[PDB]
Amino acid sequence: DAFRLIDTGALINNLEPRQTTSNTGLLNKANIQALIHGLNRHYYSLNIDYHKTAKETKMLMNLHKEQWQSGLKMYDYEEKEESNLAATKSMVKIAEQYSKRIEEEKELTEEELKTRYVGRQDPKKHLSETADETLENNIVSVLTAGVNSVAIK
Amino acid sequence: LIETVFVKNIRMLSFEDISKATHLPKDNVEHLVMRAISLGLLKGSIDQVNELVTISWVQPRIISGDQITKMKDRLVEWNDQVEKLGKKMEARGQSIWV
Amino acid sequence: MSLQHEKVTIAPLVLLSALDHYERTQTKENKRCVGVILGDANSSTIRVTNSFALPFEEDEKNSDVWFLDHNYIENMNEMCKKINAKEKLIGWYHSGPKLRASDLKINELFKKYTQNNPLLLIVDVKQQGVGLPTDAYVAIEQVKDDGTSTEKTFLHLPCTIEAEEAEEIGVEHLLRDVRDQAAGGLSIRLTNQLKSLKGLQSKLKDVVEYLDKVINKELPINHTILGKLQDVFNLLPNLGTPDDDEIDVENHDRINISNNLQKALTVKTNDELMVIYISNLVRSIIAFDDLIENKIQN
Amino acid sequence: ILDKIFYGVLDQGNGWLYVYETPNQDATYDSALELVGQLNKVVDQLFEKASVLY
């Protein structure tokens, strides 16, 4: 935060209202007691803005061409199998709790059901999440593998 | 042996091909090529059943004006390929990249 | 000197300083700004922390004629040592873009100050090359063959940015862009696959025209380039090889696994179909009962 | 061969022994059979659940 002196004089002579014209004011509620008393009786706070040119933005924004050169390099392909394999096993263990969950689950009152069939830590959610991660990844993996091969020869 | 394999696009030569290149019988060629591996002239594998010598390394030899042309020709082929791929994949997925 | 120079990491702060400084000294009409770069050195990572302009003049009429102020370099050293002592004088940035042979001559004055080969940090100010806004080059002295005199020349090294912790954290609050690359979701990297191919294609064509220029416009033959291209033809996969057959098997497996994942997502989407129906079924009864009860009450 | 320490083939129609020391095919397909296995039961269950509409 930014500050600027408000005199002792201002406080006595009821000149604080003059001081806050054409402003929206900024209060920092946190930190009180003393500290806050001093703050209120010493300075005035106002918003802080960050200005930059768009030549600066472009620099900030910039990376490199070796950024994309790396993005054409391919991992060892056994490790990729490892991940595809693993996901399938991963999802087996959570498909049992999901299987259990939907056996009945018709009983009246939602709040009760959340404890009974473990709707917290939702197995449906957790299954879709793992499937979807592995899936976007394996579309990039097959794509990259083919692109490199056709490109080069 | 080192000059011939380079200039052809293939980087495998039959004992049959080498025999004409070196203008010496295929009996002498098999003995000669083995030594090339020992020296480190060429390094690679000898298959007498497929009648090939497969190189995987071409040892630095000084390049000259002519040879520059042969390289230019191979890279021409390569540039046209990247272009064909890129035009193809732009049209495809056009709707949704982002 | 030290040959340790492997990477040059460049704070986002140095770049901001150099732009600002270029425009506040109002060096224009390819008037070069030359300023000092401070940081650590004689390390594998050179950590480039900061820069400050030095007084500087460059005359367009003849490029031999320039001023640089010796005393300013000196004054700054005791100030910068107090501020942060890990800083050392390490060389100079050039506004660039052009790589001059006036830089051999400027390097020799910086070579008096420095304990390393003078680091030349070409911070492009126009930012035309979006990628590579930085080139790094280190002065070497090496035996030039063909019975020619020893030459002092500029060998490229990785100028690639890494950033310090303190700088980085503020920068990240400012931006929210998907940048050149973030490797975000599927959408982001899918863009990347097209762009990256296009990167390569650009790179590749230039190598083709460089070879024409050797034999048409008589550049002195840079044999280094030719060496690299031999390694490209030789370590080039050969087609018809049974390795290619293996590749196809790996492809077959992953495309299958995609198919099984696609089906499992069907089971998830299908569950949502029923649950929403269940809810609708109860609600029909809730709304019917409103109507009958409003009639009875009235 | 039945025990399985060299697993190869004997030719009665000639007289050669071929040796194969090739252990085992894809884990990938195997674990994929398990995932499909669970899913078959699961859909029937859901369908059971989904019969309040009927």
Q: Can you walk me through this structure?
A:
The PDB classes it as hydrolase. Keywords: Macromolecular complex, 26S proteasome, Protease, Hydrolase. The entry is titled "26S proteasome in presence of AMP-PNP (s3)". Chain A: Ubiquitin carboxyl-terminal hydrolase RPN11. The structure is cut from a larger assembly and holds chains A (153 residues), B (98 residues), C (298 residues) and D (54 residues). With 98 residues, chain B is an alpha+beta fold. Chain B has helices spanning 2-7, 15-21, 26-39, 65-91, and strands spanning 12-14, 42-47, 52-58. Chain B contains 4 helices and 3 strands, in the order αβααββα. In chain B, strands 1-3-2 form a 3-stranded antiparallel β-sheet. In chain B, strand 2 and strand 3 form a beta hairpin. In chain B, helix 2 (15-21) packs across helix 3. The longest helix of chain C has 55 residues, at 243-297. Chain D has a two-stranded antiparallel sheet. In chain D, a hairpin with a 6-residue loop joins strand 1 (8-10) and strand 2. Chain D is rod-shaped and about 70 Å long. In chain D, 2% of the residues are buried. Chains in contact: A-B, A-C, A-D, B-C, C-D.
Question: Any key phrases for this structure?
Answer:
part of a larger assembly; 4 chains; C: about 300 residues; alpha+beta; Cytidine Deaminase, domain 2; seven-stranded mixed beta sheet; two-stranded antiparallel sheet; 7 helices; 9 strands; about 50% helix; D: about 55 residues; two-stranded antiparallel ribbon; 1 helix; 2 strands; about 10% strand; EC 3.4.19.12 (chain A)
State the CATH class of the domain at 3-177 in chain C. Alpha Beta
The number of helices of chain A is: 8
Shape of chain C: extended
Question: Compute the gyration radius of chain A: what is it?
Answer: 30 Å
Task: List the chains of the largest interface with their residue counts.
Answer: A-C, 48 and 49 residues
Helix count of chain C? Answer: 7
**Helix-and-strand structural type of chain C:** alpha+beta
Order of helices and strands of chain C: EHEEEEHEHEEEHHHH
Strand order in the sheet with the most strands of chain C: 1-3-2-6-7-8-9
Q: Could you spell the SSE succession of chain A in H and E letters?
A: HHHHHHHH
Q: Specify the helix fraction band of chain A.
A: 55-70%
Our estimate of the beta-strand percent of chain A is under 5%
Main beta-sheet strand count, sense and barrel state of chain A = none
Assembly type of the chains comes to part of a larger assembly
Could you give the count of β-strands of chain C? 9
User: How far is it from the N-terminal to the C-terminal residue of chain A, by CA?
Assistant: 60 Å
Please state the structural category of chain A. Answer: mainly alpha
- Give a quick account of the main beta sheet of chain C: strands, pairing sense, barrel closure: 7 strands, mixed
CATH superfamily of the domain at 3-177 in chain C: Cytidine Deaminase, domain 2
Proper CATH architecture of the domain at 3-177 in chain C: 3-Layer(aba) Sandwich
> What is the total tally of β strands of chain A?
0
